């Protein structure tokens, strides 16, 4: 019991500055400027989810809230904070609350990697395309405590099925980063976008890694998206999966934290295989997806904000392509999910690593 006095010894000794320096939250301005761009990266991806999925179905999408659904990600996220989140009756309590936290704090901490904009980089760590695949492997644990602590039979079945899916698609995702870590001679995500900043478009890694972009793309969407996911129990293998007994603010981590995972996946397709904050000649004509003049005040305000946010704008394209793949591929079953990340995506991710070499 000699460690009973130990944990309260450095507790109050740290608490004197843990309350005193508690008010100064996000004291660096490029940390607060990131978290606003982090939040509106996710809030687009909920608006872009409901609007692109309505466009492929020839319905409107959310009108009547905001101008054209601009507040529809906000009200869908604010109603979950206001709902009286009550636990199931016979269940765990501590494992139930940290259920969604272990799933989504990995995709929040590993948001510190992505260098969106030439003048917005939070920290250039010594790695980070390896720290991302390390941190995202904590997420199968949270799918096991969401499944266990919810204490119904069908969410254990959904918890063991969601964990064994994320198990299967992390190892081809590890080798798809190993292709562009071999070309870039490093894991630094500033060094990775620096090898693609030489010729603008013709030096992007998707032109050099046509298969490894496809290994990354199928493995990323098999860990964040809605297309290869049995959490909709339309096959009735479970009731509703591991996200069954989760209501209110804990479900908001399962709901909105799957869009942080979609954006962070898309933010790294547009760093590895596409040049992060890289773009062609600014002084272009009216048909350059811009205005009509050559030097507008609306075009001096674009490239100043495009200078701080271009990788996320590129990530807004692969968010759009992930929704356009949802209404294209069939909802494939779990027996053919795990026969893809092991029997198909693991050899062609290993073959690409040898073809990224000389062999």
């Amino acid at each position: 019991x000699x460690x009973x006095x130990x944990x309260x010894x450095x507790x109050x000794x740290x608490x004197x500055x843990x309350x005193x320096x508690a008010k100064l939250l996000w004291l660096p301005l490029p940390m607060l400027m990131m978290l606003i761009v982090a939040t509106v990266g996710v809030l687009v991806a909920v608006w872009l989810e409901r609007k692109i999925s309505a466009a492929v179905q020839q319905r409107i999408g959310p009108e009547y809230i905001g101008p054209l659904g601009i507040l529809a990600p906000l009200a869908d996220g604010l109603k979950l904070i206001f709902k009286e989140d009550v636990l199931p009756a016979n269940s765990d309590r501590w494992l139930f609350t940290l259920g969604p936290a272990v799933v989504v704090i990995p995709v929040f901490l590993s948001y510190i990697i992505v260098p969106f904009g030439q003048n917005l980089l939070i920290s250039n760590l010594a790695m980070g395309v390896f720290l991302w695949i390390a941190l995202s492997s904590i997420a199968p644990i949270g799918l096991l405590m969401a499944g266990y602590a919810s204490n119904n039979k069908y969410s254990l079945l959904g918890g063991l099925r969601a964990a064994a899916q994320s198990i299967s698609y992390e190892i081809p995702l590890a080798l798809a980063v190993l292709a562009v870590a071999m070309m870039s001679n490093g894991l630094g995500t500033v060094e990775i976008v620096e090898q693609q900043s030489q010729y603008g478009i013709l030096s992007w890694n998707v032109w050099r890694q046509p298969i490894g972009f496809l290994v990354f793309w199928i493995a990323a969407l098999a860990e964040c998206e809605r297309l290869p996911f049995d959490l909709p129990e339309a096959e009735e293998e479970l009731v509703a999966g591991y996200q069954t007994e989760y209501a209110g603010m804990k479900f908001a981590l399962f709901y909105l934290g799957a869009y942080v995972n979609l954006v962070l996946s898309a933010l790294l397709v547009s760093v590895l295989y596409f040049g992060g904050w890289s773009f062609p000649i600014p002084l272009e004509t009216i048909a350059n997806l811009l205005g009509v003049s050559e030097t507008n005040p609306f075009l001096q305000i674009a490239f100043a904000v495009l200078g701080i946010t271009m990788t996320l704008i590129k990530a807004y394209f692969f968010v759009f392509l992930a929704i356009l793949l949802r209404w294209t591929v069939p909802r494939v079953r779990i027996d053919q999910l795990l026969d893809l990340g092991w029997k198909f995506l693991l050899p062609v991710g290993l073959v690409n690593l040898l073809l990224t070499a000389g062999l």
Partner: protein
């Protein structure tokens, strides 16, 4: 007495004090719950196809923020799109108790309002869904049009906005729990999970096959 089924006098003063700041933080509490409320993808009888036609492209579901969530926990609204018999009446109260407390049932069709055309002579039909669960909006029709239920969403959306934030405590059920002991014999469960490998399907029994 003097008036049957009376209304009890609210003896509390109902001091619902609200300044400019709390009323602004109450309009956001109501707008976020009316403009994005999620219906449980539920329905038993014919009236679900008048509700599933509202998921489609002609009448848009996700236009009022309705996203059909096929789980009782993630949903709040429950449009009772079907006749409730003696069976499924325990199942419906279970899907209603498994809900975060700003619930807002709306009835749908004649057979959840008063059990409409089975209200005359039918031995297992609940005559109205509000014999089981408390309902917000009613909706006559058999079936209603998909336009007619979107008016009942609009009538529901007008009812969320009236809800003050200081009345969140009255949304929880109260437990006037009483207990009693009985002498009823417990019956073994008749519905066990074996159908094909039950010991009566493999072969016809004796004293039956002789006449065959």
């Amino acid at each position: 007495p003097a008036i049957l089924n009376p209304i009890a006098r609210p003896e509390v003063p109902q001091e619902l004090a609200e300044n400019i700041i709390l009323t602004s933080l109450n309009d956001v509490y109501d707008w976020a719950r009316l403009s994005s409320l999620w219906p449980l993808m539920y329905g038993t009888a014919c009236c679900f196809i008048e509700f599933a036609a509202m998921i489609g492209s002609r009448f848009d579901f996700d236009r009022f923020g309705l996203v059909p969530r096929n789980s009782p926990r993630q949903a709040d609204l429950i449009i009772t799109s079907g006749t409730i018999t003696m069976k499924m009446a325990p199942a419906l109260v279970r899907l209603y108790e498994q809900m975060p407390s700003p619930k807002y049932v709306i009835a749908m069709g004649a057979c959840t309002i008063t059990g409409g055309m089975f209200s005359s002579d039918s031995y297992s039909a609940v005559r109205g869904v509000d014999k089981l669960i408390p309902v917000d909006v009613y909706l006559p029709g058999c079936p209603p049009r998909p336009e007619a239920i979107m008016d009942a969403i609009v009538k529901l959306r007008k009812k969320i906005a009236n809800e003050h934030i200081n009345e969140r405590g009255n949304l929880a059920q109260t437990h006037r729990l009483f207990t009693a002991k009985h002498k009823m014999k417990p019956v073994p469960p008749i519905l066990t999970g074996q159908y094909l490998n039950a010991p009566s399907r493999q072969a016809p029994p004796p004293a039956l096959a002789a006449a065959m």
